[PDB]
């Protein structure tokens, strides 16, 4: 009841994840999700990502490889546990095991 | 000189004297009079006095043994529990630490300037130790039973149930022998023990 998963993804991923059930309107009635497209500037994405992270009632964040790669420094600038950030594959961007913040914290184990 | 044992008088006298009641400087800087070390002191007279005890009371020895075990166990625990921030204590460890601290505060510390501490008779100490040990024993057994079965009992539920009886036990210190009679104190402690049992049954 406390925290709610977030979603920053293209139309396919966000429709699929919203059909999974997640997504609520907050006090400002902003959406729990964001729409990313080819017609979506970097500044909007970065500002929305920080907006979500500042809304402490979210807790979990879902971002694919590509969106995170676009704002890579803003992704790896975050080292905290409770506001978890997830790196997931995508049909349009299948996972690369060499690219994860958590495995970068674990880099050197092999 | 300096409180140590290297001085020849200390070494010579320690090999002759049947009982030793050494003092600790730090505890005297705490003004925790009487300032006894409680870990180096000894007495080679327990066995001889067991016969005398078993003629009148027959119940002092188990209480003395259990109290000494609690105190020594806490003395072992202290630095170890300090090393880990005093966070990862099992239930038995927590009851041991708290009960030992309370015992040091109340049942091992006095000054005669009050009428209730100038002389603690044998029966008064017997009752004090008896009820304190019964409290510790029943808390430990309450923990153990539900730890084996289900719903591990913490100190919190016992406090929430019977803090009144717990502080009735804490206040046995000040049952003044100058004013209260011997029968008054004995019956008071017995009533508090019966209420200990009944409250713990109510919690069950």
């Amino acid at each position: 009841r406390g925290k709610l998963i977030a979603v920053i993804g293209d139309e396919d991923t966000v429709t699929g994840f919203l059909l999974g059930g997640i997504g609520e309107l907050n006090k400002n009635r902003h959406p729990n999700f964001l729409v990313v497209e080819k017609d979506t500037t970097i500044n909007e994405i970065e500002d929305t990502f920080r907006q979500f992270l500042n809304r402490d009632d979210i807790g979990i964040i879902l971002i694919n490889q590509y969106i995170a790669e676009m704002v890579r420094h803003a992704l790896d600038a975050h080292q905290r546990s409770i506001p978890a950030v997830l790196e997931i594959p995508s049909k349009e961007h299948p996972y690369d095991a060499a690219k994860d913040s958590i495995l970068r914290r674990a880099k050197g184990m092999f | 000189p300096g409180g140590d044992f290297s001085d020849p008088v200390t070494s010579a006298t320690l090999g002759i004297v049947q009982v030793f009641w050494g003092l600790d400087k730090k505890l005297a800087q705490r003004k925790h009079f009487p300032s006894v070390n409680w870990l180096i002191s000894y007495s080679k007279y327990m066995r001889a006095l067991d016969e005398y005890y078993d003629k009148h009371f027959t119940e002092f020895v188990p209480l003395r043994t259990k109290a000494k075990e609690i105190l020594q166990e806490e003395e072992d625990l202290a630095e170890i529990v300090q090393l880990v921030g005093k966070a990862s204590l099992a239930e038995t460890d927590k009851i041991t630490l708290e009960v030992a601290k309370l015992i040091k505060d109340d049942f091992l510390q006095q000054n005669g300037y009050t009428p209730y501490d100038r002389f603690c008779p044998f029966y008064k100490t017997v009752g004090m130790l008896s009820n304190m040990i019964s409290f510790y024993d029943m808390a430990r057994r309450a923990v153990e039973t539900t730890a084996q079965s289900d719903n591990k009992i913490t100190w919190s539920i016992i406090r929430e149930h019977m803090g009144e009886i717990l502080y009735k036990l804490s206040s046995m210190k000040f049952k003044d022998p100058v004013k209260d009679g011997e029968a008054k104190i004995k019956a008071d402690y017995a009533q508090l023990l019966e209420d200990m049992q009944n409250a713990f049954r109510s919690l069950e």
């Binding site: 966000v14 609520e24 309107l25 | -």
Partner: protein, 208 residues
């Protein structure tokens, strides 16, 4: 700096012996704690890669079913995005005492909100229900992965703290006290020797 400060005396020898013994016992204790932490680290970082590859497989299935949903009914994505008022699965914040330290975890919680009915666009209920079930599974599995990686990201700070403490106890505190013990024993031997020479010379004079 190099040596503890205390006057050479036999009580000081016993006291520094006690200090060294306490240091050694704390050393051993924190090594055992570090061993437990390293074992926990290894068994939580065992096959997270395999869990994530399984997630890849699951969402391959999900993308295929999404393509099927696009195929049979045509266009409902905008209606899904348009109507978003309240969620259907939330998270119950929790903590996990894997060891002496605590590590955050999370729990999937079925809030139970009713799903939007798709019956107008070619009566696409069965296929949308299939996609709903697929993503219902995906949500729970990714909550499990989220708990795992949250605890894993938390553990490292405690690991580093424990390692630095053990290393300091092994590098700084012990050699200093050992050097002090050498200094105090040799100084006490010197002083007993001076008294001995004094006694020798007085008996020499007493020979007269």
């Amino acid at each position: 700096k190099d040596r503890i400060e205390i006057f050479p005396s036999r009580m000081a020898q016993t006291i520094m012996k006690a200090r060294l013994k306490g240091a050694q016992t704390g050393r051993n204790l924190l090594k055992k704690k570090s061993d437990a932490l390293t074992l926990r680290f290894r068994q939580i970082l065992k096959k997270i890669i395999e869990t994530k590859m399984l997630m890849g497989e699951v969402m391959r299935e999900a993308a295929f079913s999404l393509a099927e949903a696009k195929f049979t009914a045509g266009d409902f994505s905008t209606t899904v995005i348009q109507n978003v008022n309240k969620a259907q699965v939330k998270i119950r914040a929790k903590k996990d005492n894997v060891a002496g330290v605590t590590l955050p975890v999370f729990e999937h919680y079925h809030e139970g909100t009713d799903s939007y009915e798709l019956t107008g666009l070619a009566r696409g209920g069965e296929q949308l229900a299939k996609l709903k079930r697929n993503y219902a599974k995906a949500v729970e599995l990714l909550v499990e992965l989220a708990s795992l990686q949250t605890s894993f990201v938390t553990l490292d700070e405690a690991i580093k703290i424990t390692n630095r403490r053990v290393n300091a106890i092994e590098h700084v505190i012990i050699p200093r006290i050992e050097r002090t013990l050498a200094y105090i024993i040799t100084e006490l031997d010197e002083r007993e020797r001076e008294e001995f020479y004094r006694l020798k010379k007085i008996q020499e004079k007493k020979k007269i």
